[model samples]
Target chain A: TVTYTARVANARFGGFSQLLLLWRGSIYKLLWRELLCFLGFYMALSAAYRFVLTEGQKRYFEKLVIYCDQYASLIPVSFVLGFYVTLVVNRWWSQYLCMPLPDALMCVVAGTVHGRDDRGRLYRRTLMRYAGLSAVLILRSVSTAVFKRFPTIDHVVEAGFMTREERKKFENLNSSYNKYWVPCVWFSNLAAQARREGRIRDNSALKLLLEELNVFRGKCGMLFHYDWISVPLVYTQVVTIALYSYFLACLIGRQFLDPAQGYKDHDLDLCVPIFTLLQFFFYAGWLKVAEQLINPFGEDDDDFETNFLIDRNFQVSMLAVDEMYDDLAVLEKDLYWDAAEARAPYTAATVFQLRQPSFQGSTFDITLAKEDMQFQ
Target chain B: TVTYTARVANARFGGFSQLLLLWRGSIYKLLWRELLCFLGFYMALSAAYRFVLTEGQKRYFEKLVIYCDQYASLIPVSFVLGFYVTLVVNRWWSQYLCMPLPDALMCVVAGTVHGRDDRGRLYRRTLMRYAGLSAVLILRSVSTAVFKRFPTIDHVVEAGFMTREERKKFENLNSSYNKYWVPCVWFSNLAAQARREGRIRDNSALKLLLEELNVFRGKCGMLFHYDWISVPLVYTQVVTIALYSYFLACLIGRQFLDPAQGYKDHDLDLCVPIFTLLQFFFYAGWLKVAEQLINPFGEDDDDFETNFLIDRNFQVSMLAVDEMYDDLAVLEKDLYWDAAEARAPYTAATVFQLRQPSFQGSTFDITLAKEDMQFQ
Candidate 1:
């Protein structure tokens, strides 16, 4: 039940303010270091104007500040940041959705590949092993964490994703090409071989297995493509340059030009730049979200726990093929089998979630009169 | 080739600003009418201030303008607009991706379900027809464009997506449900029957076919869920109110006052509110992107051509399964079949796209120099 974060749905109604307190992956945690550095840099600039700069230098610096402030507005900060971040986040999600959990494929394998014998067990496990191994090979290619654990073919062998003999064939078949595809090829061929042997109940089932293999293969290709063409480096440099320069302008433009000087909106000499700090935190913090997720295969909190994922994928896919295969909890009467209006009893602690007259449609409240009821 | 718009590519070098001049499905086309209306209203208000207002009234309105100018930033216009527009665009793209093409399923059928006869052809055609029918049925429920096309069940029958006999049975089996799923049910039941008749050569292939059917079904369900949840009504209302109210503020705030008694930003006595006009154009243009893409299945220029999609689904699926069934192009060796280093010749226009090497890996450039490579 505590498997697959894909269904990490059904969230909370707790007090809203309690969220910002979280230490692990909150905005506060993500921005604290950047916030301090920005604040420090701003303070250093402010001190130069108030103390270090002579009267002539101060006036010159003040003009530069105003110049920078005026020009900063021209940078399409949100437009580019918004689009780029959305693209990056979407790429990450598409890859995650295409992660190939092997649930659907394994279910077919379990039901169709039949026999209670040792050979039957071998057929199911080995078939699934190929699926698991394909995933491992893919993860190692993209995820630095996975690559560290499976640095060599020997490591893959040690991890049981590849047998020593299979590894030999894998290594021998290559001519300076991607070998991640080998397992999928083997899966289809072995499935076909099994179809011929009659262990797989029907040819349709074998074709189904092969079709699933191709879907799996297609997703792996998608991941490789996603990795190859991320948000281009040139685009990244553009945004970073814009944001840093904007702050450089802000440090001067935002400095109250001495309360005595009748400069526009410089009536007060507040030492602290409260709003400027917020502006930095808001933009920089969002920028960090993109940085945090540009590649989600790291050991960071927001990043996919690739090592954990490797284990989960191996364990879950193997278990689905192993224990859950040809195994049923039991077919039983439903909770409301005979009840005309079916409803389940809610538990006390979670009873708050229960509701009647469920959401039927978006246009539920609208109605047509007698004349309008029938379509002409 | 135009059966579906999948695998759409991009090129953008034909005098970049030329896109702005486009009429059909262009931002200019979508915005021109609204832009005119906004400008008209703005001018009407400006005219009232110039011609109708007395000295006392002018003083009253100038204060309103200054207040509106200062208070307009509270709306969070860009924040909501960016997020909402991205959500809408993504929803459109995801729906497009999930638009149940029979290409993959048809290829498997053509490859696996063996027989050169009509019976074999009949089986493939019926299965794919069921797929097309299911897509049409689902589209009608969500898309007014599709609904108008098939206003009644008889229209569905007349269109050849469903047979009169199937329609009779479909109506007879109704239990006050959507019945959009009826075609998918028929597809699965027929697939099982085909397996029994040996029309479908193997259980594995049939399983693959049925698995594909469910995937198609799942995609249909996704469209339904997406139609339900996205750009939630309350959120839309909130944004509309904010945008309309902020612009209401802008109409007054952006008015040029008499330079004789200068209020802050109203130093210029120019008759036009140039910057505010551009701001309105930008904000409203951004907002319209969401409106354009919100119900992509509608009849707007930017909307999906639902009629074409339906015809294409049926035509291409029929062609793939019926005419192309058991057919093969001459099996000449491919350009890369013989050579290990297979580099195909690029056309003169596209020679710039030719590359000597493809990307190897994300981490390929990072060398650890032996010592730093190992985990401590």
Candidate 2:
């Protein structure tokens, strides 16, 4: 549910403003309910001060308003939220990068694990299947969507990612740890077996297969680590307390006081508390961003598409190691092989684009004195 | 230059405060000069208002003080610095992680490339040398200390990281790009040669060696990228302007106004701006952190030790691939080989520590109703 911005890649008139109209993952969608509640509470206090109180009581209410206003500035809402959201956003982007992809592993397997026979095809295909199985197993432990789709090991077998014999062997293992690494272990053993059978041809190729498998396994471990060590509970609570208390103070403090008392800066009564409402949107909207990004694997509008990734990796991996194995275009001399400097032609639309001069170094343009430039 | 806290591994009383006594990379060392300048300017402003100003001018100054105080609150110093410093600190840590280390590449070469002859020794050592050479070349471009140490290619040759024949070939290459990657190309060519000479018995081992070399090369590329694309200039300028301007207003705004005139919040003149000075330290000290971390390869005491890293990488890489080549210990059975559940004994100091229960999941402790717990 991530938003696309390719249409507005460059700055144009009325470009960024158009993003506000988006319904999905919009700030208005997230904050509208809280904003309404804030308004209701603000108006209730305003009515109580203006209409319900007597003249002497009105003076007392004014004193209370000034007291709340003075102390509200002490909370440092922006300072706390600013640091909290920065940490959360950083973790969110890192989680995306740790996602297990099979592109590199599949390409390496297709190129190195040699054979045109059925056994060769099985060796390459099963190696990729183990990789896909490892990702699915790890994703199920962390992602809600993946967990829902595959609630049990039986579902994994039924999905064709695991066979009956393999599942039986997996169940017999006596380890007390998450068995997501079991497939990676199987991958290495099978690769070694292929080397002994001469299908892998060389020990160096077998070593590479193991190395690539380890990289994929390392990414899976990192994904789980991020899920386990989320932003600390105490830190999140501290930020929440600071934000909510500031707004709670604003509820009573930001009232449009009557101008009759001649209090400084209370010369006008706009009735709506325009700036207070605006502040609510600004700070509260910032908090909502942290809430969504804190657990980006959840079923939120901008959370990562983990289930889609699972399918894409499986589909692409199978094709790369099986159908695309040993596939190559015929080698031929290029059209510019005899040319001194070959350059690709730009399209008509892109032809007018001017290329900027290449940067040499930061100090390349610094003017040196004539004597200083001389060799010492 | 990176600070090590291994001595304070456990949280104990007075442990963190001990760090304050050290002055090499302490906050006091960084901020002392700026603090003095700030105090002098503040005292000058305070002295003019109390001693030099006429009674009529004092009244005008008090009015200006209140005006400056009210408007100074508009600058969001903490909010801006929080985001800016977070970005700088993240990039700083990423740059450290991207530092080129040849440990993995040297180990792979020593373990896979087989020979006891001089040719075999040359093959292993030269491969490791190329890795060391690539890292030194890139470090020279980015680090001030490294550049000062190796000002010319001749220095790299004198340091024994390259030979005259390799340098001649490197210089002959007619390319308009940084030659940091040339050694990596030589590494691949040499690895391929070993495979052809039968020193590397298999294609897979050569492939693994080249893959490890690329990983080391990729880290060098990322180091250069971080140096090239700094945090945006405009963002740093905005943060600086907001911080300095807010403090500038504080100088006039936080004066000891005459209490007899009876301003609401300005009741007592303590003869010093205590809170304002504390705010200056808090905000300005935070700004100093961003400045130090912005270019971590600089000559600051807290900056990375890039020259030390270069020497260590070269010295260790040579020892690993040459002296440690094909070195193996005799395999023997472990003491606990016959034990059903093997456990290592802890030290007397650590034995008393109770192990914490492993966390299962956030919802593992949830109490479901008896009826809801029944199988459907």
Candidate 3:
């Protein structure tokens, strides 16, 4: 029934996912190019507007160019911001909460069994999985922190640079919002895994630790839920920072830049770092929650059932052994049994005869008869 | 076989139509809103660019404003243009060639029989059906005309308001470029419908009229098919018109009028009408072709078959009449047979005795009793 239900659900949601991918692909390919045309017209119109306003009044056209450049910087930033918002929400919900427990178990089991061919390989694969999970958790948390600090960042960027006094004031606010809960969650998962493996079999101690860990997880889950509200705000910060950096770079670079030189160097440089950082921070945050949920065997209340998994493996291996032995016994009987003994021959002589080769006139005929009668 | 093929075709196309509707609904609700948000940000960024460029410039900004405003006016016009393009194509096709005769006859027959009631309501229904078809044809013709004229119209807007001499030149150019085939095509549709109904059966006169009408439709279809080259020009016009109009309105209203007050009275009124007209025109044009192809009769070709429909109505009515007569005969026999038979026996005593009800009953009983009365 469970398999049936899963199949039905997969059909319903998977079909939509496939179509959504197609729709997005089409829009991305077909409609997105229109943006270039729109941008070109927008910039030219801005230039014309500036020309009219300050043609006789002042050196406004130069300022107008700066303005257009500044605004142009914001476009890429907004796109990045939108992308990050979608990415973070998707990671949190899809990776941690939405993924079914059985799916995760299946992955772990497959990985463990496949890795068992070599001890070192097994250890490396396990380490890699945990490490990747940890990294994502850290990134998710840090990005969330950075997102919360966006207002101050925006103010600094708008002013072009922060004064020494303002910088000092902002420094205190910068790292204050960082939380240690992600690392704590990771540790609890590790503890839970150990407990489940029977490494620490003391029930009393395990219960106490698990109780404390459950409280922590509960608090974290609540905090995570609350943090969702701050996502949009964080997205805004990331976008503003990107835009401001681009604006400043373009403003200074254009003075010394060639009209037709290699291309906009500032735009290129800023995009790479900003996007990389955004991806890093985003994944880090998600990994923290994943580790907590996946390895709840020790002190964490939600880890994998390691002892149960071990027993299951043993049971399967034993069944395979049993089947192998039964096949071997059947082969032995087929090789040794005699047809005369298969009839109700009751005596030590009959048993002895079955073990010995009978003298015959033709060896081939004797062998053939024995072969045909052996299983009788 | 034909019915089965039609059913298969309907299923295939109907599935696609359903999927398209689903996609449209999803995109309209989700992506459309997101797009609007992006548009808002784009507008804001554009506004900021203008602020810096035209802060001190005067005459340049004035020209820019005028240019922008003219562009904005094209939005509504573009919609109307699209609408008329659809309308003209539809109208032309309907008028020039009467659809296949079998299909038309079926439609009339189906409508007449199905529509019948005690008061001849079927006749009125047939009229309404043809009227709807005509309307679709007319709209399609108008749409075609508008699409063909889009580039010129857009150019006029982009150039801003023309002086009196320039206006005359523009008008002359517009008139010269505007194909006169659309109206002629629309009128021919009405005439064709009338001819099919035997209202205009004069062969020589009808042939002459049709010959004159066919020329325009043929030209329009050919031109439309080859319109890819001119499409980019139309796009340029629409984009330029929309962008310029908005820019000018913002610049002028901001400079000369109170920035807040300027927005209230900024007459971008032309945008809505032009947009509506173009949209309807395009819809009408496509629908005209669809109606012709789908219905092939002077009626709305949604799903029902007019010819089969009329046949079905006749079939059902005949069944009802036949059933009534059959029931009436059975009832007449039930009412008169027993009494009349009893009275007939009195007129012929010897015949009555032989064929009496008691004698008949006794003979039938003896046949049943023969097996039990074996001695007999």
| Candidate 2 Cα outliers beyond 4 Å, as residue runs | A7-16, A31-269, A279-325, A335-357, A360-376, B2-59, B70-75, B86-90, B102-125, B158-160, B198-212, B254-285, B308-376
Backbone clashes in model 3: 84
Each prediction's whole-model lDDT (CA): 0.78, 0.87, 0.31
> Residues B180-266, candidate 1, lDDT per residue (tens digit)?
788899988988888898877777788788888888898888777767776688988888888888888888778888888966666
Ranking by lDDT: 2, 1, 3
Cα-based TM-score, every candidate: 0.66, 0.69, 0.18
User: Lowest-lDDT window of 10 residues in candidate 2 chain B?
Assistant: B70-79
Q: What is the per-residue lDDT of model 3 for residues A1-376, given as tens digits with 9 covering 90 to 100?
A: 0011111111121322232243211222233343344334444544454345444432344444445554433335434533553344334323333111111111122212111235423322332233222222322343333223333444433433233453454444445553324334443565456456543233433343344334434434453444444345555566546645654443332321122223332111111122222222222222222323222223332222333322332332222212111111100111102221111221332232243233222323323333344321
Which candidate, 1 or 2, would have the higher lDDT against the true structure? Answer: 2
Question: Candidate 3 lDDT, tens digit per residue, B157-252?
Answer: 222211233234323432222322222322333333334445434433333333333333333333322221111111222222322333334333
**Candidate 1: residue A160 Cα off by (Å):** 9.4
DockQ of each: 0.20, 0.10, 0.00
User: Which candidate do you rate higher for TM-score, 2 or 3?
Assistant: 2
Of 1 and 2, the candidate ahead on DockQ is 1
Model 3 interface RMSD over true interface Cα atoms:
43.3
Candidate 3 at residue A40, lDDT? 49
Minimal lDDT window, size 10, model 2 chain A: A359-368
Measured with C-alpha atoms, the lDDT of residue B168 in candidate 1 is 86
For model 3, the superposed segments whose C-alpha errors exceed 4 Å read: A1-57, A60-75, A92-240, A245-376, B1-376
Evaluated on CA atoms against the true complex, candidate 1 attains a DockQ of: 0.20
